[PDB]
RNA sequence: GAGUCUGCGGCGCGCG
């Protein structure tokens, strides 16, 4: 929010509405400035987020952050197996690939 | 969507009887003293302030930022003056919509919780 | 044209009456139905200008929470019913029109009971105002204005007469809007958008008319990006 | 072959949240921060 | 004009370089900055067509997973850094331009080392392509095209030279968009919208150019509502 | 006007 202050602009109608619904909630002490409230809310680990599809905010602060996430190994179990027709066992006559 | 909110009662909650209770707690609300959802038996100032004729009328006010969906308001339904929040009214519709027999839709739904 | 331009949004319409009207338009590139549907929705609700009861004055009543003898309904129920009244004026000269009505005795008061006004029309005649018993005296003056969106009775606070009571403003002729974006298949690439927006109107205007007005308010706004400074 | 993360793959964080990718959303409409910086993954709260 | 039309959105611009460009426009009625800002944003990211490395050919290299002697980086790391290259051509006549570069010995290969082409410009000069040791022979041909969105190297599969290797397409000259709607005061009513959207560009195109293209893609789409069916 | 032959038992591990 510091760079935001200097870059030239303050709070949105969006950022203010979520605050109302936020204090009605109990995430920010009622009576403090939006600048001071967003901080309290930010310290809570959640910030304001806009939908992206509508541009409207998401009623209520949503936490966000850097989470370390790994990709699991893709076995030949992932790479699907669908069979029409094919080989058959020599003694039992059941299908096998 | 269907839950109602409750916030602050520091000054009188008795609008049930005085007309000076309607004006005073309506101004006290405009002020900082009485919330839109106060434990005031009959109607917290939140219902006093807004009254919605048609069903739709209720939600338009919501989109415009006048009432949250979880706020306690008054609305006129098919034959009753029902004191039920926007969300609860919205849920009623969704159901009423899924199955066109709207009356048969309120018969089997409870918008009281 | 044949390749990319003929492959143009097929505007399909399905409107019954002047209240409902579905509007389908496809194909659309990636995430465009949403980009078009949401704005048009925000416009259709607030932008389309209209007519709503802005204030009312019962002659013997002082406050909004009173009850009139010989009248079943309470002032609150009546002022409510007035919000339901949909009027239609024909020209700018009519900014604020006050409709007058007075009925007495064992009669039902409908919206067609209002004394006709030259340039104003009432498309909501049978709307029920009240039920008068006996010695039922109801004489009121209900204000009507042209505006946009929703204006709480608290925000404007109209005062033609000192004892009159303001009413919440319901200006748009469109009650509700709705748009869905379901995938559609164009031979080559499956990732496509299909926008269908359903519009509901009180009758004053038609869903199609509303849509047209909406896209215009949007285009007019897109031109406001002309002169830099 | 290059395995570009696709809907079929599964990912999980060191704690224990496991899950598969259900939808590759376009940067165009997913949750975005006040500043244009958009989120990359959206995790369901209920699984916590 | 003087009253309502002169009272028109004052388009003000503030752009430094071809990367950043703020765009302010006020006054706006109720909730319109949002109605205009979000769509344009969704457009600015997806729609705006651009440029990206479509294929590459190292002379002695056959596949994408090889390593060139005298060159620290591996073909994969290099092709990666090429995706980072942002070029800017000036006219439609240049649909596909092949940039050529060859450097030898103890020199660092930067993007300005590409032999200049008449109608094409490189706004990413200092980009690090590779570090050449000694006897470091690197002679490559990197294709460049004009397109839209993201195109996997697998989807197009370009083949100028049989042993060349395609690269993933990154066509948005815009990295990020941002718009704010702060209240503005017009003498009479305080409820007003002011929309200022900040746009950042790789350099290929300019924020202003991008905006113009965006509004156009929106208007062109507003015309697709013409023929009912 | 196409069809043979191989992949079993067990062991280890890992997923739901």
CA-to-C1' span, A82 to F5 (A): 22
DSSP secondary structure letter of residue B65: T
Q: How many CB atoms lie within 10 A of CB B26?
A: 16
**Cβ <8 Å between C229 and E13:** yes
Residues in chain E: 229
**E27/chain C closest Cα distance in angstroms:** 10
CA-to-C1' span, D10 to F11 (A): 29
Coil/strand/helix, residue B48: helix
Helix B86-98 / helix B55-63 crossing angle, nearest 10 deg: 120
Strand partners, C139: C102
Coil/strand/helix, residue D25: coil
For E111, how many CA atoms within 13 A lie in the half-sphere containing its CB?
19
Give the separation between CA A1 and CA A35, rounded to whole angstroms.
9
Do chains B and D touch by CB distance (3+ pairs < 8 Å)? Answer: no
Q: Check if A55 contacts C (Cβ < 8 Å).
A: yes
Beta strand extents in chain C (DSSP E only): 10-16, 20-28, 50-58, 87-89, 96-104, 108-110, 120-122, 128-131, 137-147, 150-151, 165-166, 169-170, 174-181, 193-201
D contacts of E198 (beta carbons < 8 Å):
36
Provide the token pair at E77: 């790391």
Q: Mutate which of B16, B18, B57, B93 to disrupt the C interface (most C C-beta within 10 Å)?
A: B57
DSSP secondary structure letter of residue A46: E
Q: Mutate which of C28, C29, C31 to disrupt the D interface (most D C-beta within 10 Å)?
A: C31
**Cβ <8 Å between A9 and E183:** no
Burial C80-105 (b: 16+ CB within 10 A, else e): bbbbbbbbbbeeeebeebebebebee
Q: Map tokens 């339904």 to a residue.
A: B77
CA-to-C1' span, A83 to F2 (A): 21
Sign of the C-alpha dihedral computed for residues C182, C186, C189 and C193 taken in this order: negative
**Cβ <8 Å between B51 and C80:** yes
Touching E: which chains, 3+ CB pairs < 8 A? A, C, D
**Cβ <8 Å between E183 and A13:** yes
- The answer to whether C222 and E219 are in contact (CB under 8 A) is yes
Beta strand extents in C29-164 (DSSP E only): 50-58, 87-89, 96-104, 108-110, 120-122, 128-131, 137-147, 150-151
Residues in chain D: 48
Residues in chain B: 113
Provide the token pair at A54: 């509508």
- The answer to whether E28 and E192 are in contact (CB under 8 A) is yes
The residue in chain A having the minimum alpha-carbon distance to the alpha carbon of residue B35 is A24
**Cβ <8 Å between B49 and C175:** no
Residue C55 sits at φ, ψ, to 5 deg, of -160, 160
Give the separation between CA C104 and CA C69, rounded to whole angstroms.
11
Please give the C-alpha separations between residue C160 and each of B5, B27, C63, C146, in angstroms, as whole numbers. Answer: 36, 22, 14, 16
Resolution of the structure in the document, Å: 3.0
Sign of the C-alpha dihedral computed for residues E140, E144, E149 and E153 taken in this order: negative
**Cβ <8 Å between B64 and C176:** no
Give the domains, in start order, of chain B with CATH numbers: 1-113 (1.10.274.100)
- The answer to whether E79 and E165 are in contact (CB under 8 A) is yes
Strand partners, E180: E196
Q: Is C3 exposed, middle or buried (0-12, 13-18, 19+ CB in 10 A)?
A: exposed
- D positions 3-42 inside 8 Å of E (CB): 4, 26-29, 34-37
Q: What is the dihedral of CA E181, E187, E191, E193, to 10 degrees?
A: -20
CA-to-C1' span, A87 to F15 (A): 27
Helix A13-23 / helix A34-43 crossing angle, nearest 10 deg: 60
What is the SS3 assignment for C132-155? ECCCCEEEEEEEEEEECCEECHHH
**E118/chain D closest Cα distance in angstroms:** 35
Give the separation between CA E146 and CA E132, rounded to whole angstroms.
30
* Helix residue ranges per DSSP H, chain E: 32-46, 75-83, 153-156, 207-222
Q: How many CB atoms lie within 10 A of CB E38?
A: 26
Closest residue, CA to C1' of F15: A77
- The answer to whether E18 and D4 are in contact (CB under 8 A) is no
- The answer to whether C51 and C171 are in contact (CB under 8 A) is yes
CA-to-C1' span, D11 to F16 (A): 15
Q: Is B73 exposed, middle or buried (0-12, 13-18, 19+ CB in 10 A)?
A: buried
Give the domains, in start order, of chain C with CATH numbers: 1-49+172-225 (3.30.1360.10), 50-171 (2.170.120.12)
C contacts of D28 (beta carbons < 8 Å):
30-31, 35
Q: How many CB atoms lie within 10 A of CB C42?
A: 24
The residue in chain A having the minimum alpha-carbon distance to the alpha carbon of residue B32 is A31
Please give the C-alpha separations between residue A25 and each of A30, A61, C7, C221, E95, in angstroms, as whole numbers. Answer: 10, 10, 49, 37, 56
Task: For residue D11, give the nearest of A52, A64, A72 by CB distance.
Answer: A72
């Amino acid at each position: 929010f510091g760079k935001r202050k200097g870059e030239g602009f303050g709070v949105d109608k969006r950022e203010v509405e979520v605050l109302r619904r936020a204090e009605k909630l109990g995430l920010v002490t009622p009576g403090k400035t939006p600048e001071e409230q967003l901080k309290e809310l930010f310290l809570q680990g959640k910030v304001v987020l806009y939908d992206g599809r509508t541009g409207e905010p998401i009623e209520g602060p949503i936490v966000v952050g850097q989470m370390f996430i790994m990709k699991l190994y893709h076995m030949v179990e992932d790479k699907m197996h669908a069979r029409s027709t094919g080989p058959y066992s020599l003694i039992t006559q059941q299908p096998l690939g | 969507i269907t839950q109602v909110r409750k916030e602050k009662k520091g000054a009188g909650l008795e609008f049930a009887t005085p007309e000076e209770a309607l004006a005073a707690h309506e101004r006290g609300e405009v002020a900082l003293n009485a919330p839109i959802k106060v434990a005031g038996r009959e109607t917290s100032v939140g219902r006093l302030k807004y009254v919605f004729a048609n069903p739709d009328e209720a939600l338009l006010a919501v989109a415009h930022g006048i009432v949250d969906l979880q706020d306690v308001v008054t609305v006129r339904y098919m034959g009753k003056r029902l004191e039920t929040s926007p969300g609860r009214i919205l849920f009623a519709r969704i159901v009423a919509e899924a199955v066109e027999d709207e009356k048969v839709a309120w018969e089997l739904i409870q918008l009281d919780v | 044209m044949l390749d990319s331009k003929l492959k143009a949004p097929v505007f399909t319409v399905r409107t019954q009456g002047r209240e409902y009207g579905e509007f389908v338009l496809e194909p659309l590139e990636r995430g465009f139905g949403v980009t078009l549907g949401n704005p048009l929705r925000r416009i259709l609700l607030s932008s389309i200008p209209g007519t709503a009861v802005t204030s009312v004055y019962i002659e013997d009543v002082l406050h909004e929470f009173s009850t009139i003898p010989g009248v079943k309904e309470d002032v609150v129920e009546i002022i409510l019913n007035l919000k339901e009244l949909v009027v239609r004026f024909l020209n700018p000269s009519l900014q604020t029109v006050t409709l007058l009505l007075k009925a007495e005795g064992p009669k039902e008061v409908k919206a067609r009971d209002f004394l006709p006004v030259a340039d104003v029309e009432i498309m909501n005649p049978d709307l029920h105002i009240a039920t008068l018993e006996e010695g039922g005296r109801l004489n009121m003056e209900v204000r009507v204005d042209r505006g946009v969106g929703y204006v709480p009775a608290e925000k404007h606070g109209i005062k033609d007469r000192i004892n009159a009571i303001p009413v919440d403003a319901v200006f748009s002729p469109v009650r509700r809007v709705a748009f869905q974006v379901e995938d559609t298949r164009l031979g080559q690439r499956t990732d496509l958008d299909k926008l269908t927006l359903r519009i509901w109107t009180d009758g004053s205007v038609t869903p199609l008319e509303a849509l047209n007005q909406a896209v215009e308010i949007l285009r007019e706004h897109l031109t406001y990006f002309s002169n830099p400074q | 072959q290059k395995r570009k993360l696709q809907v079929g793959d599964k990912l999980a964080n060191r704690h224990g949240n496991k899950g598969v990718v259900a939808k590759i959303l376009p940067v165009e409409d997913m949750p975005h921060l006040p500043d244009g910086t958009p989120v990359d993954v959206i995790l369901n709260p209920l699984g916590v």
